[PDB]
Amino acid sequence: EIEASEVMLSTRIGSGSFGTVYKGKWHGDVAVKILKVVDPTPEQFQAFRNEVAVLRKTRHVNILLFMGYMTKDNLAIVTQWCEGSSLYKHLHVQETKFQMFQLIDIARQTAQGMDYLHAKNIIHRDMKSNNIFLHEGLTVKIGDFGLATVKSRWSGSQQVEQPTGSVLWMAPEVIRMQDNNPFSFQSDVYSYGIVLYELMTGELPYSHINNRDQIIFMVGRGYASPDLSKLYKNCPKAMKRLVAECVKKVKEERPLFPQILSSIELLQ
Amino acid sequence: LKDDDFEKISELGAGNGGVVFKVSHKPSGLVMARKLIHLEIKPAIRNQIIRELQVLHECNSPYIVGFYGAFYSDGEISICMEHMDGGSLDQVLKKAGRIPEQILGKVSIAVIKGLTYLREKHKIMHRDVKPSNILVNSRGEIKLCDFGVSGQLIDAMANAFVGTRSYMSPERLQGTHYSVQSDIWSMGLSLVEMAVGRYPIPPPPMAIFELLDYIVNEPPPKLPSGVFSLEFQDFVNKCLIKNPAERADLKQLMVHAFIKRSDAEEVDFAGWLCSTIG
Ligand SMILES: Nc1ncnc2c1ncn2[C@@H]1O[C@H](COP(=O)(O)OP(=O)(O)OP(O)(O)=S)[C@@H](O)[C@H]1O
Ligand SMILES: Nc1ncnc2c1ncn2[C@@H]1O[C@H](COP(=O)(O)OP(=O)(O)OP(O)(O)=S)[C@@H](O)[C@H]1O
Ligand SMILES: O=C(NOCCO)c1ccc2cncn2c1Nc1ccc(I)cc1F
Ligand SMILES: [Mg+2]
Ligand SMILES: [Mg+2]
């Protein structure tokens, strides 16, 4: 745990699915996310602390550092601060004009980071364009990975085991909740495929649906899928096959991240 | 209206879209509700949403909440509405086990009058008829809030985190053509959720998509018979019809015997609300 006296909370940045972001100055610039959990049960807190350990070990150029947690300023996590904005801001809010090779490079770096995260058996749930930051300009940084014990609420000693996070990137199998543990490598692969669609389209999927509920229902039932006619004409064909591969409804047919990385390495 | 001229007094509530704060207007000295909806959108979309929300100035009716202005401060769209002491009706379900039938009829009358005012004067459908989106006052007034004035605001909201419950009609979830009948279906669902002391999609927890499948392909929920009048069961059943064509439109709802009888009845809603919320 990190002692809160050394950390200093600067101006608020925003809020998300399971925490609120403050700018901190603990041994340099950091980001402190106070969790929405008010009374973390000892079991949840202990499993979260084990996470704190595992995520603190993780070290890739493509994932943000995870310094630790603090239980004094309510329940909080200290992570690496990223001056570069989020990928969602560049693609949609700022409408950043990325060249073809730049988009391919963002995809490659994201795939590399998720590959490492998956090699240590870390399922980066809540995978979306919000959690990807373009540090130094183009280096991709994955954040808010793991933390399954916190993102989901707890019914005492039992995790609620219900979906949480944005629905445009959520997998049909984790949308349906047909299994107690639907979060897996293939769910992260589908979420990466959704971010791939956003990279290759510049727009959020299911733009013809205005209500999130209709999105959830028609995604889980399969009536709605991200149509591939929105992709750029200059997008290479194998890139289109790769993204259609990643976004397939069937869980097991989606490729694992080494295969995707080989795909972009062929593309480049 | 600007951000610097409000002093947050308290929190009115927080939802998936945003959080509403009870604040004060320094230039005028009156207490108003300030809804902060956090979203990351283009500045052009921000201006478009603000201009579309300006239309709320001429939406004046006893059955819709007041509106003073709207503006974008920092990464959030802020809307300024008039303060309802009773909050919303979901607060009342958290207070009382179940809403009585007569006040439920008063609520139904208020919501249909608000819906028909909106449709006749503004050609605007609510789309969000929920227990959280109708508000009550200490004097007995019942108003509608969070209806679809700005289409671009709805489009920006579409990118939202997963929810816990839903009040959507099946025709919207299926993607078919929707009209006010969707709002009638939603308000019928709301009437069921008020009359019984629980969220009535899974009839006497279940995930969001399972809720949505269940309300798409299985029969609509119905009130527990024997503890409610036949008239209010007829009203909700006509409201809760899967087929939009068979579902009653507003014009039939005004002349619906439930609405006329509840209008004839005199119910001291202000006193009951004060008793149940303190
Ligand atoms: N390490 C960080 N460095 C800089 N900004 C950050 C960092 N972590 C979060 N933010 C910002 O904090 C705001 C809210 O982020 P979050 O709370 O993580 O929500 P989110 O990332 O959009 O989605 P989730 O599911 O809640 S993680 C956004 O504006 C992020 O850009
Ligand atoms: N004018 C008001 N007076 C009193 N309470 C209000 C007023 N406006 C909003 N509230 C409260 O603020 C809460 C937050 O509302 P929202 O942010 O719209 O979330 P919501 O109404 O629950 O719907 P969603 O789908 O969850 S965003 C409401 O549930 C009300 O209890
Ligand atoms: O607030 C909204 N939804 O919140 C609950 C879930 O819908 C909401 C939703 C859609 C919308 C389209 N144009 C404005 N919109 C909203 N804002 C709003 C509008 C008028 C009033 I009067 C009060 C308000 F809060
Ligand atoms: Mg994030
Ligand atoms: Mg609301």
Residue numbers in the entry:
A (entry chain A): 343 to 610
B (entry chain B): 63 to 266, 307 to 380
The authors write:
CRAF (RAF1) is one of three RAF-family kinases that initiate MAP kinase signaling in response to activated RAS and is essential for oncogenic signaling from mutant KRAS. Like BRAF, CRAF is regulated by 14-3-3 engagement and by intramolecular autoinhibitory interactions of its N-terminal regulatory region. Here we describe cryo-EM reconstructions of full-length CRAF in complex with MEK1 and a 14-3-3 dimer. These structures reveal a fully autoinhibited conformation analogous to that observed for BRAF and two “open monomer” states in which the inhibitory interactions of the CRD and 14-3-3 dimer are released or rearranged, but the kinase domain remains inactive.
